[PDB]
């Protein structure tokens, strides 16, 4: 099954895929990545242009400045970048969360 | 659907799970991890505790040499470690290959 695969990457990679869907703009994933120290929810989109949408509307005010202490300005903004860069983005997201 | 998950995590984390299978010993994954700098083929097994089996026989001597400079001594032997440490292993592995 594929639920085991998703369960594997939570513990191996610190990234949980909630959903996969394809709309007219492109393919998307509802994604949450982090540990107890820091959790970030976002949307990954693939157009190959890659679109990362940070989700902060429902976030707690107490949770945000701790992220803002640990994470760079650009990580709180919606971004667009090419496919080859995706691993580096993961390295940015992972490293910032373990501060 | 299943393939898109594997495809995403290939670019995001540099980890591709070819197959998963479940036997008497437990549940297993066939994994290759790396980039141009270094690739590592191994089996991930769970009984919790996690088992790490490295596949070095298919590899050439020249391939092993480059890996041995970048990788610690323990990484070439079969390892048993708890599940909580599973992300720590991914960290050291991805980080050593990129070195």
């Amino acid at each position: 099954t594929i639920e085991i695969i998703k369960d594997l990457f939570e513990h191996l990679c610190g990234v949980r895929v909630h959903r996969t869907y394809e709309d007219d703009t492109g393919l998307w994933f509802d994604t949450s990545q982090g540990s107890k120290n820091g959790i970030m929810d976002y949307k990954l989109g693939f157009v190959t242009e890659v679109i990362y949408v940070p989700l902060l509307k429902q976030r707690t005010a107490e949770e945000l400045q701790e992220l803002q202490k640990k994470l760079p300005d650009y990580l709180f903004e919606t971004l667009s970048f090419p496919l080859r860069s995706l691993n580096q983005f993961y390295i940015k997201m992972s490293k910032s969360l373990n501060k | 659907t299943i393939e898109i998950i594997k495809d995403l995590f290939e670019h995001l984390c540099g980890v591709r799970v070819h197959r998963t299978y479940e036997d008497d010993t437990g549940l297993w994954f066939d994994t290759s991890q790396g980039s141009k700098n270094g690739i590592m083929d191994y089996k991930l097994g769970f009984v919790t505790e996690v088992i790490y089996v490295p596949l070095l026989k298919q590899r050439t001597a020249e391939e092993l040499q480059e890996l041995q400079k970048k990788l610690p001594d323990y990484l070439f032997e079969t390892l048993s470690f708890p599940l909580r440490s599973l992300n720590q292993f991914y960290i050291k592995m991805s980080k050593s290959l990129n070195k």
Partner: peptide
């Protein structure tokens, strides 16, 4: 078998609902 991670709870969270 793999125990559920802390991030599993966030599947039902509200921010994911919008697809605009």
């Amino acid at each position: 078998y793999i125990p559920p991670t802390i991030l599993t709870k966030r599947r039902n969270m509200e921010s994911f609902n919008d697809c605009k």
